[PDB]
Symmetry: C4
Subunit: 152 residues, 4 copies
Amino acid sequence: RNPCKFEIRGHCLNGKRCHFSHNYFEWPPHALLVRQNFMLNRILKSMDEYALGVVGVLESYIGSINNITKQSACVAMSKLLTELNSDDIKKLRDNEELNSPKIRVYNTVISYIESNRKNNKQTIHLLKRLPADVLKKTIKNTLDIHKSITIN
Amino acid sequence: RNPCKFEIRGHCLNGKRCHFSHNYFEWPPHALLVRQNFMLNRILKSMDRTEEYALGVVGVLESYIGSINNITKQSACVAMSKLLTELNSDDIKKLRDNEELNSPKIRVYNTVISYIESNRKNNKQTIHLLKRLPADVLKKTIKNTLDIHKSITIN
Amino acid sequence: MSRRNPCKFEIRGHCLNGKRCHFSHNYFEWPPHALLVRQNFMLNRILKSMDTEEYALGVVGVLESYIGSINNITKQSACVAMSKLLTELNSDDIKKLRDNEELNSPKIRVYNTVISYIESNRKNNKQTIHLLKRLPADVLKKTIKNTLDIHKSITIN
Amino acid sequence: RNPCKFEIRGHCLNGKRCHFSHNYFEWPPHALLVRQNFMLNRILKSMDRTEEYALGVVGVLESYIGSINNITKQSACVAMSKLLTELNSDDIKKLRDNEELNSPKIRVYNTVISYIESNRKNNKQTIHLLKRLPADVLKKTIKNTLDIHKSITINN
RNA sequence: GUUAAU
RNA sequence: AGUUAAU
Ligand SMILES: [Zn+2]
Ligand SMILES: [Zn+2]
Ligand SMILES: [Zn+2]
């Protein structure tokens, strides 16, 4: 009668031994919301250093701690580009008044976000061929926008 | 704990430093409804402008029809494809089926459906068509698209 | 956090107006019900993205009107209707309806021929519309009408 | 009127004969939750004996582990692949850090991940793999995974 | 004041 | 010609 906890996380695999509900019509709403988020997560994953996070991997490479190799930093960066969308960014861009230096940085990250969609495999490579000084300011500019869009 | 705002937009990338909740079970319903919409926007995008950004697509098309704001024909054919891909042919067919037959509005309802459909299969070759097509009639196929676009969303 | 009124263009997908639209495009400020319908319009775009007299009818009506040789249907147009209908049925649902009735029963071969079409067509609708464009008109009508009723069976009781 | 039960499960196909709502703007919010789950299940399915249906994939695997129900190795590998695709790597890395250094359980956790990932990339060759492992080693992989599956979902 | 799917 | 957004 209660919603099956496995169904909530995707799909019950316990055949007919399972006496919990698999009928969405019978489910309270929270279970239908929670289930939609595990399912979207699966659907998104199907279309392709751990306690630091991708962010702490990038904050460490800028700062040269925790021995982060440049290769491991462009892989992280690729992941952080996929979490940003270019329209939240184009809204930021056209609230900065004209000729502000901050417009060119905005368009620069957009080109990488867009290049990363088409193919994250060669977008990593275009980043490695950057020299670190400029790679690290690019990295720190996309960090700043990440915190900015999301918090405040 | 409160729901991690990075998680609401996708997936937190802050590792264990982040002490907000990443557990959908604890979240209030609004954060789950919001996250779902950020997530569908992301799924949809992953299967595929010089301060005319303020006009929008619709403002670029309406300035082109009226020959104002320096909207060249090329950038209005591009914008016309954007508009096509946002209409859904089904709710045109809906409207076309509410009219008496041999009303002239029916033949307008089918040029749009052929355009939204030709644009879905090939967005570009459809653009090709649009930019060779004499500005006279393109401007009324645009104004017809733009009227359907509005009326669908006005009840 | 403060509630606003939602852009009804954005509710149906993406607003194309720009800084001219003075309605909310920020989901953090919409009321629950607007977040609920957006998702439904957005799921229809996603699904559509990876797949006049006849629309009056519908697919069931153009299929039903084939059982009575009515409204000048064509075998070609009644088979497209059928695939379109199979892609609407779900392959795990008639496996429920096939594991409840007694063994050596006369309604398992229909099921398993439905199961055998539901997913012989999940692959492509070219080989499966031909797979019945050949089947005889007698067996067609009855086998077209066999899925029609599993369709309303599943959907109501 | 009440929402069309055919549109709840997808796309009503009755044309204009249908006397129920097809307008999401008018629906009670529960029907829109349900429809989304029905459509999520469909979006996801479109990205690819039989009395074993009663058993389900877990029935089938428990059965193999205990030499019950005449379950061939092929059939327990298939089902092990399906069991894998229902697991997500991130949930168990959550636990791999909750462990202590040089536990045994860090060895098992690492191994199922290698299987999830290979199962994602090529599920047909992960099955080919599982069907060459020593029968007893296969069954403990299987038992470990079943147990991870169980407590992922029931252990807060 | 002027704009408005207030 | 007042309440709500935008200037
Ligand atoms: Zn269950
Ligand atoms: Zn808008
Ligand atoms: Zn209906």
